[PDB]
Write an enzyme that holds these catalytic residues in place. Structure first.
Site, PDB file in Angstrom:
ATOM      1  CG  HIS A 181      43.438  16.927  -5.901  1.00  0.00           C
ATOM      2  ND1 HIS A 181      44.104  16.309  -6.939  1.00  0.00           N
ATOM      3  CD2 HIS A 181      44.378  17.595  -5.195  1.00  0.00           C
ATOM      4  CE1 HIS A 181      45.390  16.605  -6.869  1.00  0.00           C
ATOM      5  NE2 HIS A 181      45.584  17.383  -5.821  1.00  0.00           N
ATOM      6  CB  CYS A 214      45.501   1.066 -16.206  1.00  0.00           C
ATOM      7  SG  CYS A 214      47.121   1.099 -15.375  1.00  0.00           S
ATOM      8  CB  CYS A 233      57.901  -1.144   8.483  1.00  0.00           C
ATOM      9  SG  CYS A 233      59.217  -0.135   9.199  1.00  0.00           S
ATOM     10  CG  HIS A 284      59.380  -1.222  13.644  1.00  0.00           C
ATOM     11  ND1 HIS A 284      59.581  -1.984  12.513  1.00  0.00           N
ATOM     12  CD2 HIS A 284      58.374  -1.815  14.326  1.00  0.00           C
ATOM     13  CE1 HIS A 284      58.728  -2.993  12.508  1.00  0.00           C
ATOM     14  NE2 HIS A 284      57.985  -2.913  13.597  1.00  0.00           N
ATOM     15  CB  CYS A 317       4.571   4.592  15.033  1.00  0.00           C
ATOM     16  SG  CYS A 317       3.232   3.917  16.036  1.00  0.00           S
ATOM     17  CB  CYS A 319      -0.857   0.012   1.265  1.00  0.00           C
ATOM     18  SG  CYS A 319       0.115   0.072   2.818  1.00  0.00           S
ATOM     19  CB  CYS A 334      42.037  12.427  -9.183  1.00  0.00           C
ATOM     20  SG  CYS A 334      42.996  13.236  -7.862  1.00  0.00           S
ATOM     21  CB  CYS A 363      41.692  17.116  -9.295  1.00  0.00           C
ATOM     22  SG  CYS A 363      43.215  17.666 -10.036  1.00  0.00           S
TER      23      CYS A 363
END
Ligand SMILES: [Zn+2]
Ligand SMILES: [Zn+2]
Ligand SMILES: [Zn+2]
Ligand SMILES: [Zn+2]
Ligand SMILES: [Zn+2]
Ligand SMILES: [Zn+2]
Lengths: 84, 91, 89, 422
Positions: free
Chosen positions: D250, D173, D145, D378, D67, D62, D247, D245
């Site tokens: 940005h 690409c 690292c 590190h 609620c 419908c 991309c 841009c």
């Protein structure tokens, strides 16, 4: 205590189907429940890429059968059809 | 009377309703409430071993209802009040 | 009735929000369980000594990597240094 | 787990082809409804007339909206025999007989692929438990690292994952030796299928990095960035706004500062310049809290003149706000010193006080911590996954860790995604 709604207030405003919103919801551009439309065009960039709650649910994707790439749940069709 | 829905109607037409949702949403999001309620829910799901909405909601909602800072409740309710007196004669 | 309405308006916002939060949780687990019945949760070693799947650190000295340009295997711990004089040659 | 109801309804293949139109329509309407019309139309009970009673539902058959706190939709479902409503807050389908939501049904979840679902189910695959969160280690290959730890933060970034999996880049690409194709190979062998295991693409990235080309991780972030954007500009056929841009970089990371210089003494005015940024840089004095570092970066400083008053402020915020905490200096001659002052960063960050306002709240998504001596350190990564689980990415050792323990760290880089505006 409360009793009565101000007459000037009623004088301006407070005097059925949800499927009826489709007409203007198609007129209307993508909206967000948290991110306010006005404040986005003011404090953010017009071209801004947005995601409501990025960590709401895990990322929703499906893996192609032959290339095994993880396809977006919106790039699948165009990928099977030609690019795989 | 039904002057409970009409009074809610104004808040929305005046953009004062979303002002209150957001203010409340924000206060709840920052206080680690939303996060904490999202975790409380997963207890009930692993513990009561069930993913039934009604079933899980009946235990989470009351708790999650107390889980609000008595601070937030006050500022936000106080905010609500000063809006009603914009559209309501006393008596 | 000045407050009755307020606490109502509040409880309304609160409940809709509680019901939304929960609705998404039960929904997601419900999917996880059906999708992965054999669900392996992530291991929580209280020492950070074990993997997400409760494994010992590899300690890779043996581990080699077949370098594409050279025809040889290269100790994993020395592939960065190896490329900086294998590729240039 | 079942609700045979929708199963029965889905037997009739003319019913599902209509149920899957009403959801997509209720979802859509939800995503394109102005707040005001989204309250008085989809969160107003047809019976009680209250808005946000509890959750409000939209009848699937419908046009009714009922609620929950006064159990009116349930009523409607027995007084009219309609058992399917959609939640106004999330577009989730509720079965009012089962008395639960309908998750498990992939079709309903992926409803936008209805009317494609056929050749989809055939040629496709649900993620593979292990690989579903893209949780994996990266072998260390010679002080790598400072990259490894940064990739994990990127490879677990909502915007970047969406970008990669949308195949947006791979579809053109133009190039082999492409940096961007490499990141996609990492994602590919981390969320899907293509001793030393999921590393193939990461090596390809070293091999690519070389043709271009030790300590700083924040340098490698900026190196990644630049490449994504650079391969985007080759992709375009066009000749080219001004410098806007499209991309992801940005569109997602770029914000802009307002440089203001007021002259309460000399008679020039508050000269103002808008300056772009891909991350903010903050100073770790005795500023125990991160808000203290932002107070500074934003506080007014007398412009010092040797033959005024100056302030830095945010003009545009980014989607992903990257904060780099300065842990090094050049202190006496060219001495390499390290700062070990612990600074506490919040789980949710507000920026309303640093703009040139309305609450603007970010969520902590990623953390890169530095350990050891300046030139020979590190790097460790911490990423937050959907559900609230944190992970620590040593090198090749991925392991869960409590939020409380993530909050007690030497924070070098911080990644916040935008979450609530207003
Ligand atoms: Zn494919
Ligand atoms: Zn009602
Ligand atoms: Zn109905
Ligand atoms: Zn049912
Ligand atoms: Zn490419
Ligand atoms: Zn660009």
């Amino acid at each position: 205590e409360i009793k009565g709604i101000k007459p000037k207030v009623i004088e301006e405003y407070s005097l059925d189907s949800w499927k009826s919103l489709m007409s203007s919801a198609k007129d209307t551009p993508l909206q967000y429940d948290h991110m306010n439309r006005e404040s986005l065009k003011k404090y953010f960039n017009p071209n801004a890429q947005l995601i409501e709650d990025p960590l709401d649910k895990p990322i929703q994707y499906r893996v192609c059968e032959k290339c095994g790439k993880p396809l977006a749940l919106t790039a699948i069709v165009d990928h099977l059809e030609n690019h795989c | 009377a039904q002057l409970k829905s009409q009074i809610q109607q104004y808040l929305v037409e005046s953009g004062n309703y979303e002002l209150i949702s957001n203010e409340l949403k924000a206060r709840l999001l920052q206080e680690g409430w939303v996060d904490k309620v999202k975790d409380l829910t997963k207890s009930e799901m692993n513990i009561n071993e069930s993913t039934n909405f009604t079933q899980i909601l009946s235990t989470v909602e009351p708790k999650a209802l107390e889980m609000v800072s008595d601070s937030t409740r006050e500022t936000v309710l106080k905010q609500i009040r000063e809006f009603l007196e914009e559209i309501v004669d006393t008596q | 009735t000045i407050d009755s309405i307020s606490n109502g308006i509040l409880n309304n916002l609160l409940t809709t929000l509680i019901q939304d939060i929960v609705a998404r949780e039960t929904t997601q687990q419900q999917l996880l369980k059906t999708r992965y019945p054999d669900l392996r949760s992530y291991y929580f070693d209280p020492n950070g000594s074990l993997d997400i799947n409760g494994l010992q650190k590899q300690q890779e000295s043996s581990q080699y990597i077949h370098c594409e340009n050279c025809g040889r295997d290269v100790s994993a711990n020395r592939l960065a240094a190896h490329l900086q004089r294998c590729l240039s040659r | 787990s079942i609700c045979p109801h929708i199963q029965q309804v889905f037997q009739n293949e003319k019913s599902k082809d209509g149920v899957l139109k009403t959801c997509n329509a209720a979802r859509y309407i939800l995503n394109h409804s102005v707040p005001k019309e989204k309250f008085l139309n989809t969160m107003k009970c047809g019976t009680c007339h209250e808005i946000n009673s509890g959750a409000t539902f939209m009848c699937l058959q419908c046009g009714f909206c009922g609620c929950w706190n006064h159990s009116h939709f349930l009523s409607h479902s027995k007084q009219i025999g309609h058992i399917f409503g959609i939640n106004s807050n999330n577009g989730l389908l509720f079965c009012f007989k089962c008395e639960d939501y309908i998750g498990n049904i992939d079709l309903i979840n992926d409803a936008i692929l209805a009317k494609y679902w056929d050749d989809v189910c055939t040629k496709t695959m649900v993620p593979s438990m292990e690989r579903r969160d893209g949780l994996s280690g990266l072998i260390n290959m010679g002080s790598t690292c400072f990259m490894s730890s940064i990739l994990q933060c990127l490879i677990h970034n909502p915007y970047f994952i969406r970008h990669s999996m949308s195949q947006i880049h791979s579809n053109n690409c133009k190039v082999d030796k492409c940096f961007s194709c490499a990141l996609d190979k990492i994602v590919h062998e981390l969320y899907g299928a293509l001793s030393t295991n999921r590393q193939t693409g990461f090596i390809y990235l070293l091999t690519c990095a070389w043709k271009i080309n030790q300590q700083d991780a924040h340098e490698f972030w900026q190196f990644i960035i630049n490449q994504i954007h650079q391969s985007y500009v080759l992709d375009l056929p066009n000749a080219k706004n001004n410098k806007q841009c499209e991309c992801i970089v940005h569109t997602v990371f770029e914000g802009s500062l307002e440089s203001s210089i007021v002259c309460p003494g000399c008679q020039n005015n508050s000269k103002t310049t808008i300056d772009p940024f891909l991350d903010l840089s903050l100073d770790i004095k005795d500023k125990k809290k991160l808000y203290e570092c932002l107070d500074s970066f934003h506080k007014k400083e007398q412009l010092k003149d040797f033959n005024a008053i100056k302030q830095l402020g945010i003009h545009k915020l980014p989607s992903v706000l990257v904060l780099q905490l300065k842990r090094f200096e050049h202190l006496l001659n060219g001495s390499n010193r390290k700062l070990d002052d612990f600074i506490e960063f919040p789980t949710y960050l507000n920026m309303k006080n640093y703009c040139s306002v309305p609450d603007i709240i970010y969520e902590l998504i990623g953390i890169v911590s530095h350990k050891g001596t300046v030139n020979e350190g590190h790097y460790i990564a911490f990423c937050k996954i959907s559900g609230g689980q944190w992970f620590k990415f040593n090198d090749s050792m991925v392991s869960s860790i409590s939020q409380e323990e993530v909050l007690k760290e030497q924070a070098y880089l911080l990644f916040y995604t935008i979450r609530q505006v207003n």
